[model samples]
Target chain A: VLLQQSGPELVKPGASVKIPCKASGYTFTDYNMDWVKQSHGKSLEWIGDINPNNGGTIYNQKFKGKATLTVDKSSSAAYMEVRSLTSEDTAVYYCARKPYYGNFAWFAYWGQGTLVTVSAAKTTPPSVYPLAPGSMVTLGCLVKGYFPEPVTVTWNSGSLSSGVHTFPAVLQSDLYTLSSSVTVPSSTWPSETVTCNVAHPASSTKVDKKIVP
Target chain B: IQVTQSSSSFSVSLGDRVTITCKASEDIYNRLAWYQQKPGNAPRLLISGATSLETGVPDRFSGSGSRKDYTLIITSLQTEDVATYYCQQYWSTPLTFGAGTKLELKRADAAPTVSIFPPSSEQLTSGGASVVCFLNNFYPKDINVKWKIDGSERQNGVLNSWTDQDSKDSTYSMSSTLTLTKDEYERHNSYTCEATHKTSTSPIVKSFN
Candidate 1:
């Protein structure tokens, strides 16, 4: 069967959601279904598995209290429900099929992942400025030590007309950091309120600065 | 390639000399790294290959250990140093991280009081100056003093600390000196002595005009 999974979902913390995977082009009860969790930019976890025939299920000990697995033999679909979500629970999840024999313990045919993001805390204010004492200075932002990846950064420049020079998020063990800069003439100061905005599923945050020479 | 930390967490006053240990399953000498992790964030690598501290790291942080055993020490622990610290080994096929020891802060008698003494008028006129920053009444003997000229960080300043023998309290005192050229002293530049204590969020910045 061709295993197909659900789309991305944005969730709030303390909430619960069920993601589904529909099996097609084959028999519904032919194989078992396994649910996996792939944290943002981290490793994968086998959340649990379910037997389609008798609705029997087994879960990874780490996920026992966090996830539930179910199957609908008549509809040829498998489902996984995650509860009491937190930022640590934000991840992309997939549903894979387990064949009858030969390493039935592992997932065989896999489906695309469904990204699940949970919002909780707020992002830190970015360091924005005329970092030094000059008008012809290159303005920049240094956003450090934040989590639950995929943060979008932008500038609130009114006069500066250059593209944002952005840096890739560097994973410092646990935190992900993203920095960006744009150069502008000293003339863009005093009148313009240069602001840095960071958008994440957790929160949309921004820092404002009154440019000075 | 297993790593074990005996305790998951420990507590100490800010400025206390704190050390966390990691023991490997077998001998893995001089092949270790130490990382600090705040909750919900990535871990920052503090020391790697055993005893070498990362560049730009404070002098109060250090590492040392032997085969299969490693330790990370933070001298004069500050409140900012509160986090989970882990040790990792890369000697074998699979790299492993220790279970991590969370460093929690204990309440001290008081936060450090920081004051800066600008250079004497004679020294400023003679083209040389020595500005001193004094910190007192702090517990646990762990304090970090950083120098800043304008807004940029400076290094090589002299730091000295000692227990307060004159008092009945167990608190300590420390000071840092920033020597400057007469040209630097007379420029009316902003020189700052930032005293950092583990119990506070922001350093006590003593700036001289």
Candidate 2:
């Protein structure tokens, strides 16, 4: 079983990275292949697994929004893209072979891990969804293409503070893309302004938006 | 036609034995099903007619029971087992659901605190406008949500709902969508999002003027 993995990659936080794995020495169409994430000395994480022949995939619930898996039939290859990179994502990733079994998926053979690191960079601004009152609205600030740590994301709603809830930033499967959100009541949001604040060693900036009644 | 889940929500480990029991008011026989629903998504059938598993569902999940009593058991609950579950029966025309049960990974979160996003009106260039009502986060999967205009119920528009999972916390979120005409919205009419659950005294109403 030959599982060829991509080389180590370094990207600025807030950018996108793609890793590829090619298989050979066996019937590529006969078995499934999976992608695994290994943090510094941490246990393996099954990001997702794909059926090469059918191009169907099932991901770990935890990795649902963090990882995207794809496969190519003609090249006998599988690819994964890590979007919105961040520092916590500096880790080694691997590809494994899953033998044909009934509802059983285990990595019997593995590929060399691909090391990924993130550095600070002026990244993309946040994306805001349509606003509404008596409704829950979220403001997403994406911080990627940056260093390993000491970076942060903050949500600010000027004046519309009551009943507001904010959650910790969520790291992607690669731990590079960091996404943070703050939800608020839309009724009180009209004529209000909210800001996404990002702080990194290289740059610190804020993106402000208004809610129209 | 009474259906009750023994617990509203349960906490479980990876390999734990998770069993959800549903006690019905009358005989339900082998005509029951267990459905799993995640926040922001449609319900998926897990077990149907008592003991049979739905296609593609893992063997770790099973259903067993007979007349008036039934059990939906997860032999080895995986992390993916975190979702709202309901025991339903088609023995009659109206059908019915158990009070609906929620299963959490590490904690037993409470029933969804219902709320809605304020309604917005969009003037359609073709003719009238569409007034939309969107519901926000709530839990347990099962919800009784309706719309009203000027104190009377309005069903003239298309209505829809979705579920969402809070990644930071294991809780669930859901929302609804409704569309109405521009003329109807400009008539000084008031639109309301009437939300109800088993745990509430009455429907929780959020109105938009």
Candidate 3:
């Protein structure tokens, strides 16, 4: 009933990316596993289907040569490898279940999608910006223009724990941007120097923007 | 296929018999299943093939009925049975799932501890302020949270989070936030968060300046 997918993966163009979907709460080989693709702002496309019990497969003609489906019965996991990736192959891939009894069936159980980004080998460090603050003496940090989409934004170098809310990274064009904010008490705001630290995954660049009251 | 649930939610006591029903749009034979999902957890298959209980499922949990209608029955509900249950059909193409039915154990009435927090500096400086009202240790999970400014009820910019249950004690908690513009904050209006619960005769009110 549950399918846990692997985390988001970043791979360069022409490389191969394999995503795993782990199933639980039921017999692993009793059903058929199917792969689906959803690009940003687009409808879903069925990539292929695999019978985990027999390792038999039925693939869409469009993805015949691009996707390879496999299963590990020992671990109750289904894997799909998309080889020779391009920017057009960048999408969120999902693994779902089709009933074994039906010749054609809809996906019943689904995995939370695994994002696979296909891009050329390039690195873009984030541009950190200080945002105007308000209630609870909060400080804002806007990090933008980062590539690979796996960047961490920390507040005061991870000094403050409570009232720290970081928004999820949002894709814009080919880059990613996100915001992090922390709330400081009025009595402590004047004495503290708040810093926004951004660490980019693709690049070894760490940008820090400090704000003084 | 369209699947429908009998009820959205049900309140029962420990050791009580519980039954949940689901109906399909057409004859699905016995190709249906039941799943239970707890908060922050994955859905667990309880019953398959309409009436076959999955392995590791307790014998007291059972499934009955057939054809277009199916039912999951618990002989004696336990404390751990507090979760949402779903029914799914796999008879043909276009698989469908019924809207989940949440099952909760009836408990003694308890009032929520209500507190209101002032807007953060970021909110105030960003041309608007968001005042948060937090409520916890609530029972039954049915409560009303409202915001008032200068004795008038306000609706715009008001947001309420889903009520979350504490796994350790089974109590419920929630938060409601109200956003006020800079001009409204500068006017020094009296902001109040009012909570109405079944256990409380009068609404609990917390104020922020």
Candidate 4:
């Protein structure tokens, strides 16, 4: 018996597919669980991974644009639900192995694969470009609070990027986030660093990455 | 010791009566809390601050605890709660969740919603087999599905299981195999297929078999 596994799933295009993975034998936080996809016969693409410990998620650029992955700490199972499929989505999908450490590298293991053939996926993960303005990007993060509490977010750039809007408590919960595009000029967007800082008044932490598109 | 969550995440059907549990590195025994979250939406402290109910949540959501075990029970799975529910520890530090339990609609079984598999007939060797049990559509990681003898909660004899086999989609369905002895099956007249995932209330027990 492997470390983790999911049941099989199948769905047509323009439809949706839900693949589940049940894990046992290890600490949830000890490793990560990610979703992998091989679409239209394309090479394997990482969908995303959730921190077994905190339920945090990081998605692959390609996948960031297509799927939604979630976890049930109670059930120790992870789910990858693909919505609005299309022919382009015809491929095998699996709940890949999550590495034990912080956040890096290839899948450590995989659940039995679930293949979903898409027909007309009306929804495509929003594509971002220019890393500049006029483009749309997604910011996924864990904002703990009530619904009306409303988490806040910001985009930073130097050329287009500037300095932090100096201040304390200018926010609420730490904004652990991911971005779609750069915020500066096309050139700067790829080079300059953009950060999403989250704070809870007494303390705060930020996680940022250099994304090139 | 290896303390971890039950799942990283999951989905439940709209009307499902779901429960989420968090395991201890060891056993915290009754010290736990659960949260609800949705993509793009903020996480609501559903069962926390000491199982102290948060304001505005429906009466359907409830919490309970015991040595090393705890539960976040949702009696009537509502569409709104469809987001994701998490079980965190109020006792342990490095606090942890069961991973992330979701309550979405269960996918229709691929084989068919209507099981032509039909109820089979078998002679009871003991007092348990005269009855039959059917358990379908259950989720979470370490779930136990079996027939309980006498009301006492023991799998010793009188009970059996079918398929520990679940869909490639753990969120979909799972099949269990079970049987009762000729004598026990016919004599008892009362058999139940009970599924206990984590806490007592979290278990799904089907009597009237």
Candidate 5:
């Protein structure tokens, strides 16, 4: 029926962006919304999608594991939300134009483009979770340590997306302060043991926190 | 317990001030950091190494980074804190964090996170209707909720919103909503509410509701 776009948004690489896609259509499930990118007149792929009625979604392999898609299929209009954005996310994003009953398709309808840069776009500076040999450590994925919006704190053994082990964290903001935290698994690290990393809109920054054990 | 502490592990409850101390042995030279984790979610950083706070952290979390004596202090805690807390270091490569401390509230001799209401057994009519999940009675820095069917993720508006319970302290009342239609509801009405609180982790839905 109608597709209302979210307000303009901006994000840096490794950072994330969540744009709400408000839509009013047939029975929410009559079709599922698909997410796509249209940059410079080219379509990227299926970023993700949500059922117009049930809020069910599946992202493309490339997009599913990377991006988060959710829905609110309540009002005559439902909403689609996107998160963990990257420069790869900056292109014009839109909900599915012609949704398949349960199949995937290119996004026909679209919301206005939201620019998510990777450089200084929306990223946290490199940080370290200081610690001694054996003591533990944690890192917050916050830009101001107090504006606790939902952000992730990733862990790796130096490998990108392929670290020894991994952990995820979230962040949020309240009346008193901004807050978030991430924990490392307990293990012995003689050399390069663990690292606290943040992947935002366009850029991904990391902070090294070693275990003393 | 069989839980093995790692380089980073921590937890906390909502509205309670907590402090984490990360200490290194005499042999290793590394910086330390701190993080937090909530229910059915992952962990997040509260304080970096010694005294440096993350870019977007509030003044409530303070770190005193030191090669030997490192400490992280939280002035006031909230419900969002009822997850876990951790500490790590940056001085060394292959950084590591500390064990997590889980903060929870015990009510009426019940376990923490005791649901107040039974599952909304709202029987579905033969027809269709939309359903949205709202993770109530909790709030942290970053909380997200999604809908799932069978075992697949359903696409809709996975929302992460918070209503600050108070205007003074850093505690938010979180709510994630999803929208669906009658047909979609009929197609995948048996949905689970997945929640993501901390970063670097997969969401934890109501056991695949």
Candidate 6:
């Protein structure tokens, strides 16, 4: 019994996003499919349940108007569409298979969660800062205030790719910040000008900072 | 409602009549179910609605009960019947499950072959050393591996590998590694690896000097 979910999705508020879960290795319609919601740093909530055989659905009263559950018997897949997406609706959604008997509420099989990120407005481009040089001629680039994360930072347009360490994005309030550092020999830093290039999806503009010895 | 089991485990010989019991805090009527779970595997439903045997389950497996008391019985126990069993009551809103009852065979099994290896030369030259203990050909998968130094139990820097089953013989193999700093390795006189399992009369201990 395997259930595979579609990958993550990014959508703006007031829009609808549909997440599909494909089932294999078993008779799909014989079991009930349940949709679950897990918000960041919060407990899980049962969004709804769907009977793939006849398209019958039972939804939690809290998500009655916000979530819709559907199924495609021919494709052996189930779908959930959350309408009017908002910051409150930004959470990881999972699909599970309910047992045929016993409690009928417990999950026996689960699908990998599909993260639905409700796109936040107010795009902020990253600001780059160069740190002090080190003995190994290390150059550190600090990028901050980039909104909606998914940014790329490279050293010298991939010229000096080795010895580069990029830290993961750190979320603060509504934006993200990150840092990258590259180490080179002392002789190379005195003659070469190293640059840090940042590309963020939220804004088309790219920022570059160069350090001169 | 709360669910309670009669016992935590049972040991029975082959062809013996084995029965497991569960009781509910309140009348739950017949909304009870029995499930069987093997090691490293998901639970399988055996009996539903207190007495209804699920399809494909053997007829020798049966359940009987009413009100707050229920019992699941296997007419003739077999080697394949060794597993953990659970009872669930879903009559009320908040479902409850009883503590599991594990079934064990009442026969002698093969004891694991325990061997300990000293740190390699590369590890000795490095900053730290790692000693490995390899256990092979054990049955019934439930075993504990521990590390001891100078007659005292050592918990730090101990890492145990997951047990792997041999596909051909159905036996299990496991390895445990104990990492030590250069200072700790030089200070300790003797390091011991102990394996405890039901098949052995006592823990199998191997030492490296």
With candidate 5 superimposed using the best TM-score fit, by how many Å does residue A171's alpha carbon deviate from the native?
A: 31
How high is the CA lDDT of each candidate model?
A: 0.65, 0.61, 0.76, 0.47, 0.43, 0.75
Among incorrect, acceptable, medium and high, the docking class of model 3 is: incorrect
Better of 5 and 6 by lDDT: 6
Model 6's DockQ score:
0.02
Relative to the real complex, the DockQ score for model 2 comes to 0.08
- RMSD to the true structure for each prediction, in A, is 17.7, 15.2, 8.7, 26.5, 25.8, 15.4
Higher DockQ: candidate 2 or 4? 2
Q: Residue A208 of model 1: what lDDT?
A: 53
Q: Which whole-number lDDT from 0 to 100 does residue B148 have in model 1?
A: 86
Provide per-model DockQ scores.
0.02, 0.08, 0.05, 0.01, 0.02, 0.02
Weakest 10 consecutive residues of candidate 2 chain A by summed lDDT: A167-176
Off-target runs (Cα >4 Å) in candidate 5 are: A76-84, A99-115, A118-213, B1-209
Q: DockQ winner among the candidates? A: 2
Off by more than 4 A, model 1: A100-102, A121-165, A168-178, A182-213, B1-209
Q: Each prediction's TM-score against the native?
A: 0.39, 0.39, 0.60, 0.28, 0.26, 0.52
Ranking by lDDT: 3, 6, 1, 2, 4, 5
- For residues A52-127, what per-residue lDDT tens digits would candidate 2 score against the true structure? 8888987866667667899887988888888887877777777777657613333346676677877653344323
Writing each residue's lDDT as its tens digit, candidate 4 over B77-172 gives 876667666555534333344556654455533321111011222122113232323333344434556555566554553323233223344332
Q: Best TM-score goes to which candidate?
A: 3
Error of 1 at A128 (Å): 8.1
Which scores better on lDDT, 2 or 3?
3
Candidate 3 lDDT: 0.76
| Model 2 CA deviation exceeding 4 Å by range | A1-182, A185-192, A195-209, B1-16, B19-137
Tens-digit lDDT track of model 1 for A1-213: 577776667677899989889999777786777776756534335576778989987776778779888888889999988999987888788887755751324333577777887865344433222232214445454454566566666677443435334555654324454444555555664456666565555445545543343
Question: Candidate 4 at residue B203, lDDT?
Answer: 51
- The local lDDT score (0 to 100) that residue B126 gets in candidate 4 is 17
Residue pairs of candidate 6 with colliding backbone atoms: none
